[PDB]
Design an enzyme around this catalytic site. Structure first.
Site, PDB file in Angstrom:
ATOM      1  N   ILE A  24       0.875  -1.172   0.000  1.00  0.00           N
ATOM      2  CA  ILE A  24       0.000   0.000   0.000  1.00  0.00           C
ATOM      3  C   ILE A  24       0.932   1.248   0.000  1.00  0.00           C
ATOM      4  O   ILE A  24       2.005   1.266   0.638  1.00  0.00           O
ATOM      5  CB  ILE A  24      -1.029   0.045   1.188  1.00  0.00           C
ATOM      6  CG1 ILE A  24      -2.125   1.120   0.910  1.00  0.00           C
ATOM      7  CG2 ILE A  24      -0.301   0.213   2.508  1.00  0.00           C
ATOM      8  CD1 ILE A  24      -2.809   1.721   2.113  1.00  0.00           C
ATOM      9  N   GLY A  25       0.536   2.253  -0.769  1.00  0.00           N
ATOM     10  CA  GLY A  25       1.188   3.554  -0.761  1.00  0.00           C
ATOM     11  C   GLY A  25       0.579   4.463   0.300  1.00  0.00           C
ATOM     12  O   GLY A  25      -0.642   4.461   0.523  1.00  0.00           O
ATOM     13  N   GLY A  27       1.717   7.916   0.235  1.00  0.00           N
ATOM     14  CA  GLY A  27       2.272   9.156  -0.339  1.00  0.00           C
ATOM     15  C   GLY A  27       3.746   9.189  -0.749  1.00  0.00           C
ATOM     16  O   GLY A  27       4.171  10.183  -1.358  1.00  0.00           O
ATOM     17  N   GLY A  28       4.518   8.138  -0.422  1.00  0.00           N
ATOM     18  CA  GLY A  28       5.987   8.060  -0.677  1.00  0.00           C
ATOM     19  C   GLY A  28       6.373   6.881  -1.577  1.00  0.00           C
ATOM     20  O   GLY A  28       5.525   6.394  -2.340  1.00  0.00           O
ATOM     21  N   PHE A  29       7.635   6.427  -1.506  1.00  0.00           N
ATOM     22  CA  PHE A  29       8.133   5.281  -2.341  1.00  0.00           C
ATOM     23  C   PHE A  29       8.716   4.084  -1.545  1.00  0.00           C
ATOM     24  O   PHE A  29       9.227   3.137  -2.156  1.00  0.00           O
ATOM     25  CB  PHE A  29       9.176   5.747  -3.387  1.00  0.00           C
ATOM     26  CG  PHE A  29       8.784   7.000  -4.132  1.00  0.00           C
ATOM     27  CD1 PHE A  29       7.678   7.005  -4.990  1.00  0.00           C
ATOM     28  CD2 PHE A  29       9.515   8.186  -3.973  1.00  0.00           C
ATOM     29  CE1 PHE A  29       7.305   8.167  -5.668  1.00  0.00           C
ATOM     30  CE2 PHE A  29       9.146   9.346  -4.652  1.00  0.00           C
ATOM     31  CZ  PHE A  29       8.039   9.335  -5.500  1.00  0.00           C
ATOM     32  N   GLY A  30       8.617   4.105  -0.210  1.00  0.00           N
ATOM     33  CA  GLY A  30       9.185   3.052   0.645  1.00  0.00           C
ATOM     34  C   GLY A  30       8.492   1.702   0.497  1.00  0.00           C
ATOM     35  O   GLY A  30       7.516   1.589  -0.252  1.00  0.00           O
ATOM     36  N   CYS A  31       9.005   0.680   1.204  1.00  0.00           N
ATOM     37  CA  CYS A  31       8.407  -0.656   1.192  1.00  0.00           C
ATOM     38  C   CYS A  31       7.442  -0.653   2.370  1.00  0.00           C
ATOM     39  O   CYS A  31       7.854  -0.621   3.548  1.00  0.00           O
ATOM     40  CB  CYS A  31       9.462  -1.751   1.301  1.00  0.00           C
ATOM     41  SG  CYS A  31      10.939  -1.264   0.368  1.00  0.00           S
ATOM     42  N   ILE A  32       6.158  -0.574   2.045  1.00  0.00           N
ATOM     43  CA  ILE A  32       5.082  -0.439   3.050  1.00  0.00           C
ATOM     44  C   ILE A  32       3.981  -1.420   2.707  1.00  0.00           C
ATOM     45  O   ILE A  32       3.495  -1.450   1.571  1.00  0.00           O
ATOM     46  CB  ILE A  32       4.500   0.995   3.093  1.00  0.00           C
ATOM     47  CG1 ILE A  32       5.593   2.023   3.375  1.00  0.00           C
ATOM     48  CG2 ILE A  32       3.439   1.091   4.115  1.00  0.00           C
ATOM     49  CD1 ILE A  32       5.139   3.482   3.376  1.00  0.00           C
ATOM     50  N   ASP A 158      10.006  19.335   5.933  1.00  0.00           N
ATOM     51  CA  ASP A 158       9.519  18.896   4.630  1.00  0.00           C
ATOM     52  C   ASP A 158       7.994  18.783   4.588  1.00  0.00           C
ATOM     53  O   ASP A 158       7.434  17.852   4.018  1.00  0.00           O
ATOM     54  CB  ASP A 158      10.211  17.600   4.229  1.00  0.00           C
ATOM     55  CG  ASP A 158      10.293  17.409   2.700  1.00  0.00           C
ATOM     56  OD1 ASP A 158       9.797  18.264   1.921  1.00  0.00           O
ATOM     57  OD2 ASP A 158      11.047  16.477   2.307  1.00  0.00           O
TER      58      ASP A 158
END
Length: 322
Positions: A24-25, A27-32, A158
Site C-alpha cells: 500500500i502507498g 504518499g511516498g516510495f518506501g516498502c510499506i 519537509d
C-alpha cells in the site's frame, strides 16, 4: 527482493504479534505493507495499520523509528490532546517495531497507523486549489502538529501536501507523515548552532524549503513555519513565483529572500490586485520576526489564522471542506 511472505506473522520487540498483508502507498516510495493484529483471518484492504520495512542499515527508517519511539507513543499523544484541549493531534501513532531476518539480510520494521489519501492527490483533483476555508483549517491543525514535535525536540523540514494524509475513518483529520529526514534540533534542550550539520544531507523540497535550508544551515523551528507559509500560498493560488526555476537553487533562494524582505510584493505577485488574504501576510510577517533559535508564539500564529476564518464568516469547526 521480497521482505515478507504474505500472511506471515511477525513479532515486535514488545512481543506483540502482527500479520503482513499486501503493499500500500502512503504518499511516498518506501516498502510499506498493510498490517493487522495476528488473527486467523488474512489482512484485508481496510487494515488499521501498516508495516514499514527497510534494510537495518537504512538511515531514514532508523531516524524515523527514533522519532516515533521518543515522540509518538499512544499515551504520550493522548496526554497532550487532553492537556492542550485538542480534538485530535495529527502525529501518527507508533505501535511497535522489530528486526526481521530474510535470506541472510537484516531488516528493520515499524508498525504505524494506516491512513487514507494524501492531500496532493485531492489538491490535483481540485484543479490545484484549496479554498481559503480549507487552507486555514489545514494550517491550524499543522500548527498543532508543529508545536507538538518542536516541543519534543524535532523539526520536520519537509511539510507539503504529499506528506499530509487523511485519517482513514475521518476525512476531517489531517496527519503529517514522513520523519525519515526529520531533525532533532534541540537534543536534551541544547539548540543546534547556526551552521550546517555534517550528519544531515537533506535540504527539503526546493519549492517549499526554508531560507535557512537554502543557506546550508540545519533546519529549526522558524523554518518549519516558513515552509507552511509557502504551502499556504501554493494551495490558495496554484502557484509559487519561483516554480519555473526549481533547477536553479540560487534563484529560488534569491526570490524567497526578496519576498521575505518585501511581503507586500509577494502578496501582489501571488494574488489579484488589492485582493489578498490579510492573514497570510500577517502570518509571514510574524514568522519573519523569529530568530534562528527562537521559540515561536504558536498561539499568536493560530489567532492570525482564526481572524481569517472570522473574516470569511466562518469559525474553527474542524471541517476541512475537501
Amino acid at each position: 527482493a521480497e521482505q515478507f511472505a504474505v500472511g506471515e506473522i511477525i513479532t515486535d520487540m514488545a512481543a506483540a504479534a502482527w500479520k503482513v498483508g499486501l503493499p500500500i502507498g502512503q504518499g511516498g516510495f518506501g516498502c510499506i505493507y498493510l498490517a493487522d493484529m495476528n488473527s486467523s483471518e488474512s489482512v484485508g484492504s481496510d487494515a488499521p495499520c501498516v508495516v514499514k520495512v527497510e534494510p537495518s542499515d537504512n538511515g531514514p527508517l532508523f531516524t524515523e523509528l527514533k522519532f516515533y519511539q521518543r515522540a509518538a507513543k499512544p499515551e504520550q499523544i493522548q496526554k497532550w490532546i487532553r492537556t492542550r484541549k485538542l480534538k485530535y493531534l495529527g502525529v501518527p501513532k507508533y505501535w511497535g517495531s522489530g528486526l526481521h531476518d530474510k535470506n541472510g539480510k537484516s531488516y528493520r520494521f515499524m508498525i504505524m497507523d494506516r491512513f487514507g489519501s494524501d492531500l496532493q492527490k485531492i489538491y490535483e483533483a481540485n484543479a490545484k486549489r484549496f479554498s481559503r476555508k480549507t487552507v486555514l483549517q489545514l494550517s491550524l491543525r499543522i500548527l498543532d502538529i508543529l508545536e507538538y514535535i518542536h516541543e519534543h525536540e524535532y523539526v520536520h523540514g519537509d511539510i507539503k501536501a504529499s506528506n499530509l494524509l487523511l485519517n482513514y475513518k475521518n476525512p476531517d483529520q489531517v496527519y503529517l507523515v514522513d520523519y525519515g529526514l526529520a531533525y532533532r534540533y534541540c537534543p536534551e534542550g541544547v539548540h543546534k548552532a547556526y551552521a550546517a550539520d555534517p550528519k544531515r544531507c537533506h535540504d527539503g523540497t526546493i519549492e517549499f524549503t526554508s531560507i535557512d535550508a537554502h543557506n546550508g544551515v540545519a533546519p529549526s523551528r522558524r523554518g518549519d513555519l516558513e515552509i507552511l507559509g509557502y504551502c499556504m500560498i501554493q494551495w490558495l493560488t496554484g502557484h509559487l513565483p519561483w516554480e519555473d526555476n526549481l533547477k536553479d537553487p540560487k534563484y529560488v533562494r534569491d526570490s524567497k529572500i526578496r519576498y521575505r524582505e518585501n511581503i507586500a510584493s509577494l502578496m501582489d505577485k501571488c494574488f489579484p490586485a488589492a485582493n489578498a488574504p490579510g492573514e497570510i501576510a500577517k502570518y509571514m510577517e510574524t514568522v519573519k520576526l523569529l530568530d534562528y533559535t527562537e521559540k515561536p508564539l504558536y498561539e499568536n500564529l493560530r489567532d492570525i489564522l482564526l481572524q481569517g476564518l472570522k473574516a470569511i464568516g466562518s469559525k474553527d469547526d474542524g471541517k476541512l471542506d475537501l
